[PDB]
Design a protein around this ligand. Sequence first.
Ligand SMILES: C[C@@H]1CN(c2nnc(Cc3ccccc3)c3ccc(Cl)cc23)CCN1c1ccc(C#N)cn1
Ligand SMILES: C[C@@H]1CN(c2nnc(Cc3ccccc3)c3ccc(Cl)cc23)CCN1c1ccc(C#N)cn1
Lengths: 443, 444
Amino acid sequence: EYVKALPSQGLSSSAVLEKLKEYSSMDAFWQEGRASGTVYSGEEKLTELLVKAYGDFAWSNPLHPDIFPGLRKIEAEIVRIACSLFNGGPDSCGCVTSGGTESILMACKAYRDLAFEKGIKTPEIVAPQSAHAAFNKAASYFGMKIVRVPLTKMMEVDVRAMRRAISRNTAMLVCSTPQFPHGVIDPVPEVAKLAVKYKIPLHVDACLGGFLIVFMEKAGYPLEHPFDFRVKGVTSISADTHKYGYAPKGSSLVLYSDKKYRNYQFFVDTDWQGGIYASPTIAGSRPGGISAACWAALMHFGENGYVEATKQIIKTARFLKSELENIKGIFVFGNPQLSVIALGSRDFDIYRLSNLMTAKGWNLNQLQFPPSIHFCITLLHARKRVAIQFLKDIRESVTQIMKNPKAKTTGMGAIYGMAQTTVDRNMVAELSSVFLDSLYSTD
Amino acid sequence: KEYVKALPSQGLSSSAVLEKLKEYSSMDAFWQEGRASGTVYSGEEKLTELLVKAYGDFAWSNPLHPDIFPGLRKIEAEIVRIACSLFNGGPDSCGCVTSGGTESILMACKAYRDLAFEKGIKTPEIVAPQSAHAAFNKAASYFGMKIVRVPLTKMMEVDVRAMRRAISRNTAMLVCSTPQFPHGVIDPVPEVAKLAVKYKIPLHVDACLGGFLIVFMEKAGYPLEHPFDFRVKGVTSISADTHKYGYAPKGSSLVLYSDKKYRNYQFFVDTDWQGGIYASPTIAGSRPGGISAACWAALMHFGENGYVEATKQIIKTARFLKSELENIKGIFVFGNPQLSVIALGSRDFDIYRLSNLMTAKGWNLNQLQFPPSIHFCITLLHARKRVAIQFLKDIRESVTQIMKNPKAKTTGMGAIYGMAQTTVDRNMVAELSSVFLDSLYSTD
Ligand SMILES: C[C@@H]1CN(c2nnc(Cc3ccccc3)c3ccc(Cl)cc23)CCN1c1ccc(C#N)cn1
Ligand SMILES: C[C@@H]1CN(c2nnc(Cc3ccccc3)c3ccc(Cl)cc23)CCN1c1ccc(C#N)cn1
C-alpha cells in the first residue's frame, strides 16, 4: 500500500496521473460542503484559471528578481492592492508570504528587533487569549515572552486587563478581526488607544477576516467600528489571500503602516561567500506560480466579485446565527458578525453535538477553554446551499441530546473534554508529538 | 507597462486574466535557452505539463487538515520515506516536507537549539564552515543562536582543525555541506562526524544543492571518495532540495533526521489554544498540498533510472567544462569540484570583469565574494540545451579580451561587487541591501 522507495524505473506521465487519482479519490470529503473552513471556494472554473495562472509561472522564483521581473511586478501589485483595501495610503507597504503564520511571524520578528534596538532584552507580546496559535510559535521561535490577556463575556479582549499587562518590555499589542475560535471582532480603536498612549506597535490579525471585512460596507453590512490603517496606532495587518481572497493555498500578506517597521523584518547577510544575500521574508526560494495564481484571483473577482462573495457569505452566516440563537439547549458565543459561529451549552457537554454532527457527515472545529464547537462559512457553503441541512442536523442532534442531558460523552468528544481538565499539560503535549509522528507513518 | 495599484471595479474574465499574465511572463529572462546559472533545473515542456496536472489534482488540499486530506498525508509520508532510503537512513530515520532549503535548515537549527536549551545551554551555538549557506545566519538571527563560521583550506573545504578548536560547551550543532554553494566543494563529512561523535554534538549535513545528484553518483558511474549520508555515524540530520535536482516544483524540500528523538524538538505544539489543541511539524500552518503532489509526481516519473541518467548527463557536462576551464591562461578553478558547480578566480586580473563580459554575451553567472570569485551551476537544462560549447567559447573570448589590458578599471556591476568586499563599514552594505529589498516592492 505505501511507496517506501524510489521505483527502479520511472512511471509514465499517464501512469503517474492514474495513481494520483486514487490518492485524490480519498480527499473528496470537502466537495459536499461538510467541512468547516478548509476550502474557501473550490469552484471548478475558478480552479482551472488558477492552475493555468500557476502553470504560466511554474519555474519562476522571486529569489531571482533579475531573471523574473514579471513576477516581481505581480508581487509589488498584490501588496499595493491590499494596502489600498486596508486604506493604507502612500506610506503603507507590505510583503507577500506563504500564509497567515508567516505574516504573523514576520510582524513579531520586526517588533522584536525594534524592541532590541530600544534596549529591551526579552521583548513581550501582549495578546488576547483568543489570538492565533502562531503568536505562540513566534514567542517560541524568536525568544519573546507571550502574555495572553483574558476575554470579556462577549469573547472580546478585556481592554482593562490588556492595559494592566503592558510593561517596559512590551514589544507589541495584538487584536483580531476576527479571532478564529468565536469569530468575534476585537475592539481595534480601544486597543489602538493603548498602542498610541504607551507608544507600542499594534498588529491587527485579519488573516481570517481580511477579504470579508474590507468589503462589509460595500456589501451593505457596515461594521460598527473602524478596523484598518485609518485607526491611528495600527502599525501592521496580516490578511490571508488563500482564505476569503479565494487565492491558492500558500499565499498571504503582512502589511505595515510605514517602511520603518517593515525594515526590521528583513534579513541581510552582507558577508556571505555565496554573495551579498538579502531576503524580505522567511524563505529563500519561493513558488512564483502561487503569486501568479493569487494575482489572477484578485483580478478575476475584482471589487464586484468580492462584494458579491461577501454578501453571499454574510447572508448565510446571519441566517444561521439567528436560527442557532433559537434552539433550546445551545447558545452562540458573543456576537459573531462574520463567517464564524461558535456554539456552547450550559445544559449538556457541547462535544456530544460535534460527535453527532460527525456521525451525520460534518466536520466542525472542536474548541476549548471554554468547551465549544464552531463552523466557518466559506463561498463553497454559500454556493452549495449547505445551511439548510446544517440547521436540520444541529436541531436533530440537539433534540436527541436533550432526551438524556446527563448521559456520558463518548468517542473523540470525550478526548477533547478530558484534554482541558488534565492537570498535566505535558501529557497533552506528548500525545500531540505522537499525533505528529503518526502523520509520517508508512507502516 | 504600468502598475495595478488597486482592485479593478469589475473583475476580469478568465481569458482576460491569462492574456494580461502573458505580458508579465514575456518580460522574464531567456532561462529556456540555458544562459542562467542554477535557477531552473529542468524546465522541460512535457515534465511541466505533468507537474501542473499533479498540482491541479490537489490544488485545494491543505496538510493542516490530515483528516480532510488523507491522500495528501499518504503522499507526504512517502516523499519523506523515499528520501530517507536515498540517504540510507534505515527504519529509525524520519523527516518532514518543507517549503525549501532555508526552511529545512531553520527546522534543524531550531530542533538543535531546543535540545541544547534542555541541556542547560543558554545561548546555543552553530559551528559551521565559512562556506555554509546564508540560511545558517538567518537561523542564528531568528532563533537567538550564536554562529561561529570556521575558515576553509586552500581546497575550499572546512578546516577540521579550526572546527575542533571552535567547539565549546555551548555548541548545539556542527555543519558541513555536500557541496557548499560558493565553490561546489564537498566538505569532509566523515572527519567532521568524528568530532560530532567524540564531543556528542549533533551534525547537520547540508545537501540542499547536492542531494538529488550525490545520492545517484555511484549508480551513474561516478562514485565519490567518501561517504556523506546516514551511514556516517554522527550525522543526525540532512537537508535536501527536491525543487533542485529532484526536478520537483519550487516550494519543495526535505529535512531528514537519523532518529525521531531529534525531529520532536522541531515540532510546534500549543496545547491550550482556544481554537483547539494545535500541533504543527514545520514553520507553516496551512500549506500548498498541490506542491507535495507535484513533488511526488516528479519522483515517481523519474524513478532511479531517470535520476541516474540526469546525473550522468550533468556530471559529464561538469567534468568536461572543469578540464577545459583548468587549461585557460588567466583563470583557475577553486578547489576540486566533483559535482555541478564550478567556481573561477584570477591572480592576473579582477575576476568580476569576466562576469561583466559574460553578462554582455547574455550569461547570468553568480558573483561570489571573500575571496573574489564567480560561478556557474550546471542543470539538466544546460545538458539538454547543450550550451557547454558556447559557454566555453564565450569564457575563452572574454579572458582573451581581458588579458590585453589586465590592470584596466572594472566597470558596471562587477565594480560594485568588488567595492562591497573592500568597504570597511559593513553597515553601509547592509543599508544598501535594505534599499534593494524596498525597491522590489516599488509600484512607482
Ligand atoms: C543588488 C545586490 C544584490 N542583493 C541580492 N541579495 N540576495 C539575493 C538572493 C541571492 C543571493 C545570492 C545568490 C542567490 C540568490 C539577490 C538576488 C538577486 C539580486 Cl538581483 C540581488 C540579490 C542584495 C543587494 N545588493 C547589494 C549590492 C551592493 C551592495 C553594497 N555595497 C549592497 N547590496
Ligand atoms: C488529535 C488532536 C489534535 N491535533 C491536531 N493539532 N493541530 C491541528 C492543526 C489545527 C488545529 C486547530 C485548528 C486548525 C488546525 C490538527 C489538525 C487536524 C487534526 Cl485531525 C488534528 C490536529 C493533534 C493533537 N491532538 C490531541 C488530542 C488529544 C490530546 C490529549 N489528551 C492531545 N492531542
